[PDB]
């Protein structure tokens, strides 16, 4: 690509060619056109999956959930025109997004009825049916997660950043565990690095060592960050990464901070959190060898809203690790209350 | 940084904030006039007779600063002169390092007079000062000395011993199916066709420092004998530095001044894969010294398209590509090894 950068101290610009990585997090994904491979092809795939024993879909990210919402109406119509008693119901996402063991098949032949493009305006709405193919929702009772397909799409062409482009997708022929690399951007330049995708923005810096600076996650996905898109992948243990490997955290020395281990029991239930190294408001942390051992993460205020004042850690480093959600500040696993017992506090009940 | 960019293939434009790596393939501030002089003086009385440049950046710095440096040395009455020459590739390492002076020269802020004592910066002077008495990699970019909108780089004499290249001028990035490893002299591109592989490289210098692993993609599970650009020539220790069927090119034409690695045949040539071809060795040029063009080459188990180097003086071939019938004793050979 060709592009220009701006400095606003002295109003001028610097232009050239190269590779540009943009901050695409916290941008609305509702303003694109989605093209799962073909209406008849997708209908045949869903039909064959239902006949095999696969009940529904578990979503890798929120982009896939929005794609299914955009598709479901035409998909149900075209399924109806072929005389199949099956309807697709799309729900909402909650974190963390657990992964499933099944995969969505690639049919030999498409269904021999219906139109040949997405977006055909005007269709007779289909009627409800006894059989439901539930895309992820609050419906883990008619069929559990051990019968749901996961990570069965590949992005072939996209225009993210331009609000009226098409996204082209196809159903893959293989089983996989890594995240889709078409939407990943990693870049370092000098003393700053970024690991990013459509829902992650992870920053690093060069102090005495390379370390994690701050992160911003609007989803908790459980695929694996590809090693082709990671900086400094060797010589690092999986038990030192701040963001767990099972939460699509990069396997990098850039994903580390001195004095902390992996945060398997952080507040991963929240819809959106932001990782900082700074004390929660009205709180102080002291480094003492008499403190307790690390456990589940604790919220700074109690269930009634009272702010705890004193916490301790054994061998951690200032500033302390914290999480920022809608509820408020949480603390890392290594930081425990000083005086008030932990039975009075709200603690995380989710493990990675 | 905040900016805008366009993709001409699709005619789509966008703006925002992020990290941008530009293709670049500069009024330096060598420490201080009164302190670099003291460092050079102490080094000369320490037994160091010269400097071996790490890159062309340092050579241009020395060539710009030499006049004022000589003026400072003469005004302080120190019997020493600084002579800077050109750059010959590859740029080999030196075992010494410049000292950090405790105090600056008392005098300083007209030309100078040539003396009998020479502190020879990189040049064609290996007899007066052999490589085993020359300093190397003795400078570091300051904390904010480099940036997108600087056009003036601040350097200072380093206090430690190191082997890696300066990380302040390195930019590497990957976006989708295109990746780049780059600095002020290298521009190394890779792609994903079936696997990740080297696509093309453009080099305007051959350094011998080490590419740091903090600025490298996919550093694990890679053998040092598979890298197309040798690790000894500041090639990244990455799977992005590999191409199927080829090993490390230790005997390529690294004597050039500006190289360009690409995978396609030299003009008017044809390569076939045969199990009855000669073994690998030094790289051979496509045109003989008399101007005649060889036209039929072989490789044993290489992969099409073939590896080729594009210098201003011809089109060389990878170490695995040998002449089929025409004897290679009359062809041109590379005289350097990484």
């Amino acid at each position: 690509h060709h592009g220009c950068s701006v400095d606003f101290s002295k109003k001028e610009t610097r232009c050239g060619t190269g590779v540009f990585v943009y901050n695409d997090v916290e941008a609305w994904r509702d303003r694109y056109k989605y093209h799962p491979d073909s209406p008849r092809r997708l209908a045949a795939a869903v039909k064959q999956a239902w006949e095999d024993g696969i009940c529904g879909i578990s979503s890798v990210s929120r982009m896939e959930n929005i794609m299914w919402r955009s598709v479901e109406g035409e998909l149900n119509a075209i399924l109806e025109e072929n005389g199949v008693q099956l309807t697709v119901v799309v729900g909402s996402v909650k974190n963390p997004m657990w992964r499933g063991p099944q995969r969505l098949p690639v049919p030999v032949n498409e269904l021999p009825h219906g139109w040949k493009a997405w977006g055909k305006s005007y269709f007779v709405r289909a009627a409800k049916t006894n059989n439901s193919f539930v895309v992820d929702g609050d419906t883990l009772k008619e069929c559990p997660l051990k019968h749901r397909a996961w990570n069965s799409f590949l992005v072939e062409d996209h225009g993210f950043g331009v609000f009226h482009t098409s996204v082209w997708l196809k159903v893959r022929e293989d089983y996989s565990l890594e995240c889709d690399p078409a939407v990943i951007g990693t870049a370092v330049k000098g003393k700053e690095a970024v690991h990013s995708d459509l829902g992650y923005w992870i920053e690093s810096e060069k102090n005495d060592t390379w370390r994690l600076k701050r992160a911003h996650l609007i989803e908790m996905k459980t695929c694996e960050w590809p090693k082709s898109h990671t900086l400094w992948t060797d010589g690092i243990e999986e038990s030192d990464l701040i963001i767990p490997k099972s939460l699509a955290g990069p396997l990098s020395h850039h994903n580390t901070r001195e004095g902390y281990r992996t945060q398997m029991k952080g507040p991963w239930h929240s819809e959106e959190l932001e990782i900082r190294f700074e004390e929660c408001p009205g709180t102080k942390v002291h480094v003492e060898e008499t403190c307790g051992t690390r456990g589940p993460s604790l919220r700074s205020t109690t269930a009634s809203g009272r702010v705890i004042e004193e916490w301790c850690c054994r061998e951690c480093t200032m500033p302390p690790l914290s999480f920022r959600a809608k509820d408020g500040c949480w603390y890392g696993m290594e930081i425990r209350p000083r005086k008030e017992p932990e039975s009075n506090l709200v603690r995380s009940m989710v493990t990675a | 940084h905040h900016g805008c960019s366009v993709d001409f293939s699709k005619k789509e434009t966008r703006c925002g904030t992020g990290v941008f790596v530009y293709n670049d393939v500069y009024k330096y501030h060598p420490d201080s006039p009164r302190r670099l002089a003291a460092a050079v003086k102490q080094a000369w009385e320490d037994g160091i007779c010269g400097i071996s440049s790490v890159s062309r950046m340092e050579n241009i710095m020395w060539r710009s600063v030499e006049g004022e440096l000589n003026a400072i040395l003469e005004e302080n009455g120190v019997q020493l002169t600084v002579v800077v020459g050109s750059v010959k590739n590859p740029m080999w390492r030196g075992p010494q390092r410049l000292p950090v002076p405790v105090n600056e020269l008392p005098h300083g802020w007209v030309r100078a007079a040539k003396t009998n004592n020479s502190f020879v910066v990189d040049g064609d002077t290996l007899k007066e000062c052999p490589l085993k008495h020359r300093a190397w990699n003795s400078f570091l970019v300051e904390d904010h000395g480099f940036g997108v909108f600087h056009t003036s780089v601040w350097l200072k004499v380093r206090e430690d011993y190191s082997l890696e290249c300066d990380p302040a001028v390195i930019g590497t990035a990957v976006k989708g199916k295109e990746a780049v490893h780059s600095d002020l002299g290298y521009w190394i591109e890779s792609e994903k066709n079936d696997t990740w592989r080297l696509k093309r490289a453009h080099l305007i210098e051959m350094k011998t420092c080490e590419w740091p692993k903090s600025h490298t993609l996919w550093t694990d599970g890679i053998e040092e004998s598979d890298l197309i650009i040798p690790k000894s020539l500041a090639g990244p220790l990455s799977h992005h530095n590999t191409r199927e069927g080829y090993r490390t090119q230790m005997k390529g034409p690294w004597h050039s001044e500006e190289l360009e690695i690409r995978f396609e045949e030299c003009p008017g040539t044809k390569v076939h894969v045969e199990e009855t071809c000669g073994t690998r060795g030094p790289s051979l040029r496509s045109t003989t010294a008399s101007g005649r063009v060889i036209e039929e080459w072989c490789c044993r188990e290489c992969t099409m398209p073939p590896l080729s180097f594009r210098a201003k003086d011809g089109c060389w071939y990878g170490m695995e590509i040998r002449p089929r019938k025409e004897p290679e004793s009359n062809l041109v050979r590379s005289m350097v090894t990484a």
Partner: antibody
Framework: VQLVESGGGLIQPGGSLRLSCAAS????????MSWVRQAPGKGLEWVSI???????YYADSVKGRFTISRDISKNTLYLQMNSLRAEDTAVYYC???????????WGQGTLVTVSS | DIVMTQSPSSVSASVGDRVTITCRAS??????LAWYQQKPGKAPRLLIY???SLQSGVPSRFSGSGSGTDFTLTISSLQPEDFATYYC?????????FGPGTKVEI
Amino acid sequence: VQLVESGGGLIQPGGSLRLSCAASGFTISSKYMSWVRQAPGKGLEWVSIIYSSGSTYYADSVKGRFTISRDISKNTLYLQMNSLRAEDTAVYYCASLGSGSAFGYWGQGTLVTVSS
Amino acid sequence: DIVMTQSPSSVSASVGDRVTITCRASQGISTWLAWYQQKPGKAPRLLIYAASSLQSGVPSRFSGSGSGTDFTLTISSLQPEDFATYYCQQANSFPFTFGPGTKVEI
């Protein structure tokens, strides 16, 4: 500058051990720190190195078993030794790299015995 | 790997005599060589680096020379404090390898 090596004793084969090196007069994050061992009656052997930037390299004999690391706050160098064998018994030194790519400052040594 | 060989295995000399020890490499490690001194019960000490440069604080009665594959360490006036074991090690590429060793007797 000073280098003092502490945590080496007796261990049974197949066991693990952790060595330490305390530095005085300089910061560990500014030098190339290395481990060298000398078998009783034999010569010297280079084990592993850590760069000032944090890069690590190993000899093929101990490639997957030993691990070198640092602690900036404590200003100490470590070596984690796992799945020890008979040929791992020696005196382990703590050395640093400087001009010529050679070792200038050595420790006082620490002996490790692997026997049942 | 680069294998380094040393000769002689042992040598004996009296006070004030000239001593010569030779190191031999198996590849082109040119001018990237160092020489050490090992006393029994002590850590090694660096004497020469870059095949000719004298480490600071070492007496000048030691001298080095060589390039390429062959190298030589010379003591001019032997002293009673200079009876120890001496090694050469290459500094050209990883892994770094030392020499078998040479003992100076009497």
